[PDB]
Every structure is written in structure tokens, then in C-alpha cells.
């Protein structure tokens, strides 16, 4: 392999006497070969590398955030108006500071073949974020974590 | 050790093997009712014992009265019952 003749997964980094004769003189020392694209090789992070790159597709951005429409808008506008009026109330009472709502997206992801992304944790978290936004639209300001978990279920 | 029954049991095999033995049951049929040989009363065809008659039609052992058969000491022949039917309807 050091001469570029073959590809093997026998190196230590893949997963994280001395007779002077050619191998065909010793039949009971030989191990059959595996296809290079099916070999178990890991990268620095400890993740297995997928060898079929021609079949990988990139998940489009915005897939894990709310779509854009007349309805998805105007709910954000209602919430923004609520926050601004609450700031005005705080000042009136004085005679305190809130941050705008922003939804984060995932890091770039690849899928082998055509199919949905089956990740329960991230999907449940996004659903929880949506439920929290609806309940803030209803009129609440604080929450109990167990109640939020129950309603998400 | 005991002799096992054949794969398909037929009336011919049982009636030929067990010749010379008394029958398991004897039943008399009348116009509207039936009885057994040593019975004093009668059973109507519209009564619950109608079930027995159905077994006689299907050549099946009447398990629903099995206890009553064990009490009376009714004989079995390889798990089958030999029944004689007397017909006075005609």
C-alpha cells in the first residue's frame, strides 16, 4: 500500500520468522480482500466515512425553520408589537428589555439516497420551539418545563 | 405398549377389528322424540339434547356430555364410539 498499489484499512488510524519469499509460497497467511468502498475507515473526529459520494445530496437550507407566507408573517408582527407595548408599559410603570425572536438552523447535512431525515431529537426540539411560539402568542410570559414537555408530547 | 390408530380412521376398520363386542350406545328414534335403550323417559328433537343428534350426523364424539359418559362406564374402542340406531319412524 505504501507504493500506491492497493487500498487497505489495516492501518491503526482506520479505527480510533520474517521469511524472504513472496506470499504465494505461504497460502495459510493470506486474507481475502474487501471492496475499498465497503471498508471501515474513520476520520479524525471518530466518524465513519461514507464512500459513495456520487449518491450524497445536501439538505437545503431553511428546512428546519418556519416557511414564509402571509400567515407565518403577521404572527411575528403580532409578537413584535406585544414586546414593544410591554416596553412602553415598563416605562409608564417606572414613571425591562427583551430580545427579538430568532430561529437557528442546523449545520450542513448530507443524505444517502432519497428520503427524510430521521432524527428524533432535532425534530422534537423544533416542534417544541413552534409550540412555545404559539403559547407566547396566546398571552403567557413564563413557563414550567414539565408543562411544555407535556404539551409537546 | 399400545397399537396406534391409522392416519385415516374409517368405519370399516373399526367395525371389522372390534367384531363380537357390545356396542357403545343404542338409540331408538320415533316420530317426534328419541330415547336410549334402558332409558325410561324421552328426549324431544327440539330439546337441548338435540345436540347429541347433530353429533350422530357428523360422526363426532359428543364431548359436551363426556362426564355423563364416564359416570355410566360407556366403553371406548380406540377413542371411537359404536352406536346402533333403531328406526321406527317409517
Amino acid at each position: 500500500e505504501a507504493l500506491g498499489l492497493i487500498k487497505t484499512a489495516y492501518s491503526d488510524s482506520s479505527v480510533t520468522a520474517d521469511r524472504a519469499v513472496p506470499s504465494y509460497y505461504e497460502p495459510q497467511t493470506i486474507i481475502p480482500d474487501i471492496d475499498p468502498k465497503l471498508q471501515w475507515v474513520e476520520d479524525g473526529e471518530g466518524q465513519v466515512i461514507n464512500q459513495f459520494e456520487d449518491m450524497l445530496q445536501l439538505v437545503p437550507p431553511g428546512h428546519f425553520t418556519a416557511p414564509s407566507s402571509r400567515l407565518t408573517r403577521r404572527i411575528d408582527a403580532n409578537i413584535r408589537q406585544m414586546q414593544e407595548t410591554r416596553k412602553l408599559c415598563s416605562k409608564i410603570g417606572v414613571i425591562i428589555q427583551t430580545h427579538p425572536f430568532v430561529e437557528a438552523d442546523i449545520e450542513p447535512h448530507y443524505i444517502s439516497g432519497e428520503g427524510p431525515v430521521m432524527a428524533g431529537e432535532v425534530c422534537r426540539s423544533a416542534l417544541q420551539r413552534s409550540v412555545a411560539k404559539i403559547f407566547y402568542h396566546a398571552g403567557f410570559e413564563e413557563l414550567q418545563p414539565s408543562a411544555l414537555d407535556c404539551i409537546t408530547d | 405398549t399400545f397399537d396406534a390408530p391409522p392416519y385415516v380412521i374409517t368405519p370399516e376398520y373399526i367395525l371389522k377389528k372390534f367384531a363380537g363386542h357390545p356396542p357403545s350406545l343404542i338409540v331408538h328414534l320415533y316420530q317426534n322424540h328419541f330415547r336410549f335403550d334402558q332409558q325410561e323417559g324421552m328426549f324431544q328433537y327440539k330439546s337441548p339434547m338435540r345436540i347429541f343428534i347433530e353429533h350422530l350426523r357428523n360422526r363426532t364424539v359428543p364431548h359436551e356430555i363426556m362426564e355423563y359418559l364416564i359416570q355410566g362406564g360407556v366403553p371406548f374402542y380406540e377413542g371411537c364410539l359404536i352406536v346402533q340406531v333403531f328406526d321406527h319412524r317409517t
Partner: protein
């Protein structure tokens, strides 16, 4: 509990009543055979 249809229960109760009446509570053997057939 163990469940079953009502029809079977009623039919079996009726059959037991009739057979108990016929056998006089077990004092009479009506299935007895005398002779050889």
C-alpha cells in the same frame, strides 16, 4: 375474568338441567346397555 358468548352459556345451562332431570341426579344409568346389540 374469562369471556365467552352468552348463547353457549345459556345452552349449556339448559342441557345440564335436562340431563340432571333425566338421570335423577345421578341415581339412574340411562346409557347402560344390556346384551350384545
Amino acid at each position: 375474568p374469562v369471556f365467552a358468548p352468552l348463547k353457549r352459556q345459556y345452552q349449556l345451562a339448559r342441557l345440564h338441567e335436562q340431563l340432571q332431570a333425566a338421570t335423577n341426579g345421578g341415581r339412574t344409568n340411562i346409557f347402560k346397555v344390556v346384551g350384545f346389540g
